[PDB]
Amino acid sequence: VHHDGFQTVKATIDWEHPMFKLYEKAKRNGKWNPADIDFSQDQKDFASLTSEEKISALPLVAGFSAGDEAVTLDILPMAHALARQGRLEDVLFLTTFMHDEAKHVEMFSRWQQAVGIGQMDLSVFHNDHYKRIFYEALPEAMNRLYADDSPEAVIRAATVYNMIVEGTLAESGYYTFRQIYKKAGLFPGLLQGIDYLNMDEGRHIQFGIYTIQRIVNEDERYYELFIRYMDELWPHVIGYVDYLTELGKRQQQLARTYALEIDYDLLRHYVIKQFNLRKKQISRT
Amino acid sequence: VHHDGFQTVKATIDWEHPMFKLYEKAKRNGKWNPADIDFSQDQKDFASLTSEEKISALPLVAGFSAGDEAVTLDILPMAHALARQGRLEDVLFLTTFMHDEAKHVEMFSRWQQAVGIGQMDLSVFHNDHYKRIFYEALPEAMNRLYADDSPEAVIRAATVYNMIVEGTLAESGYYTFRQIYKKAGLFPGLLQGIDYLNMDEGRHIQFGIYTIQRIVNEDERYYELFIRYMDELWPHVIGYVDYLTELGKRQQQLARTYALEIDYDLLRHYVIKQFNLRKKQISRT
Numbered sequence A, B: 001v002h003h004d005g006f007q008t009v010k011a012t013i014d015w016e017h018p019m020f021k022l023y024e025k026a027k028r029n030g031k032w033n034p035a036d037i038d039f040s041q042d043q044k045d046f047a048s049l050t051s052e053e054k055i056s057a058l059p060l061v062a063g064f065s066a067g068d069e070a071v072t073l074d075i076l077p078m079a080h081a082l083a084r085q086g087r088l089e090d091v092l093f094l095t096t097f098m099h100d101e102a103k104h105v106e107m108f109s110r111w112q113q114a115v116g117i118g119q120m121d122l123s124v125f126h127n128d129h130y131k132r133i134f135y136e137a138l139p140e141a142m143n144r145l146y147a148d149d150s151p152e153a154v155i156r157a158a159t160v161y162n163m164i165v166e167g168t169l170a171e172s173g174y175y176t177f178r179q180i181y182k183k184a185g186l187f188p189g190l191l192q193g194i195d196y197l198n199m200d201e202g203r204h205i206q207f208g209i210y211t212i213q214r215i216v217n218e219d220e221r222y223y224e225l226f227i228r229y230m231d232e233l234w235p236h237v238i239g240y241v242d243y244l245t246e247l248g249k250r251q252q253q254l255a256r257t258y259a260l261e262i263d264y265d266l267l268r269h270y271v272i273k274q275f276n277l278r279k280k281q282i283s284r285t
């Protein structure tokens, strides 16, 4: 439908808006290019591994590659809905958000190509719980915004995307990568990429916090919805974590070879801790 | 609706896709930040001008500020429609496209703020022809893609957006800016910004060419649609150009002060030339 006018003709950008400030930071801190990462040592590492060691790393890469691809596609409805509400500074920031996720897809796909597994179908490592989050609940909640941009809908979208997928699962994934392979001295290019992703992610999570809090600020009963939507998804979060844990416990050879005492119970407590601290970053009042 | 799978889990990015190549170039060539442009001399230039000279530059800035704001909002349906078709490399490139346009909005709005006209409503310089393109036909054609992503719809969207708004009007606007103010030695920060915009724009127009040509390649009868949609919009293109020309001829003081023989007939022929050469970049066969 028609534009009735344009904010930067009638006035200017709201230079003090929190999302204009986050946009400015995204530009300053978002120059990294996956095409510049040197994966040559990663190719040698992967080739040096036994078949049993090779498998160890793939479940986590399968979760990230599909996850980054899903969030690249699935942020578009949020950008649309806030655009239609006239939230110009949010939209500007979301152009950095979307471009970040494109680079994330690129990074994991470059790693897979470089180490020689691009032709391998890693979908085998998505269990039913993962599919419920990433194949279903995430696209459902985001696409809803095209026909329903009510405060409830927007809260639910930000909860699933920014607070669960990013703020709980992605953060725990970055922590897991470091805990395992940074210890081993394995895959330096991938770990460089992970550091860049984890930096981008701080802004993504802050968008979600801002968005949920500004709706809760209008009506503190939306706080209860936020908690409810977090708890609805917890069973699939932990069901995926338990599945990856079980895979890790069955395939021990990378841990033994590289003298990693992989503390799966500690990783599980990191996930629980992530989930709970995301809840605490939203104030009921 | 659900994701049935993910290309970068089943396989990898198509590294040879023309739009992955354009994405790669966008990252290499898209580092500029409007926040780094020094507008201090532009503020002094604008203040030094008489009121009659001040007005001269505003119609063109009004056209660009609203135009960049419109295309920032209005590219989202294209990204959605190609995402839903599975065209992952197009989507990756379109994240650079969208972020470019956000910076363009930012750049013009920073200039307006710095020279002291942010509080002025520049909508007065949008005549009926401009409104028909930017307030109506552009959003209509792009939003259509949400419910109709047929080859006809996609061709029409790319024609209005990439071939007319960008490939005809924007290009002619950049040329006009240089012809007038680069001559005068006026507004160095704005002209730095214009050079960056004009560089981004080359990729935007190439997206539109790629998109229209790949549909024409399926069925050369779509070539006739492309020409028809270009000719439908020509009356509003030139009606806006004639309006800006008339404003230029009535307010002569900047030209006299700065010894610019502004050749409005030459600018008009540049627009006609742009329109015709965009037609020629699509091959019927």
Ligand SMILES: CCCCCCCCCCCCCCCC(=O)O
Binding pocket: A060, A063, A064, A067, A068, A071, A101, A104, A165, A166, A169, A170, A172, A173, A176, A204, A241, A244, A245, A248, A267, A268, A271
């Ligand atoms: C073995 C302990 C389990 C640790 C949890 C690992 C979760 C893997 C992460 C996969 C989903 C990544 C989502 C990315 C979202 C984004 O890019 O914003």
Ligand SMILES: CCCCCCCCCCCCCCCC(=O)O
Binding pocket: B060, B063, B064, B067, B068, B071, B101, B104, B165, B166, B169, B170, B172, B173, B176, B204, B241, B244, B245, B248, B267, B268, B271
């Ligand atoms: C006086 C001669 C007329 C020259 C034509 C000037 C047209 C002004 C341009 C305004 C529209 C700009 C659209 C920007 C689109 C984009 O950012 O991709």
Ligand SMILES: [Fe+3]
Binding pocket: A071, A101, A166, A200, A201, A204
């Ligand atoms: Fe993210």
Ligand SMILES: [Fe+3]
Binding pocket: B071, B101, B166, B200, B201, B204
């Ligand atoms: Fe453009």
Ligand SMILES: [Mn+2]
Binding pocket: A129, A239
């Ligand atoms: Mn289960």
Ligand SMILES: [Mn+2]
Binding pocket: B129, B239
């Ligand atoms: Mn007319």
Ligand SMILES: [Mn+3]
Binding pocket: A068, A071, A100, A101, A104, A197
């Ligand atoms: Mn990501």
Ligand SMILES: [Mn+3]
Binding pocket: B068, B071, B100, B101, B104, B197
């Ligand atoms: Mn532009």
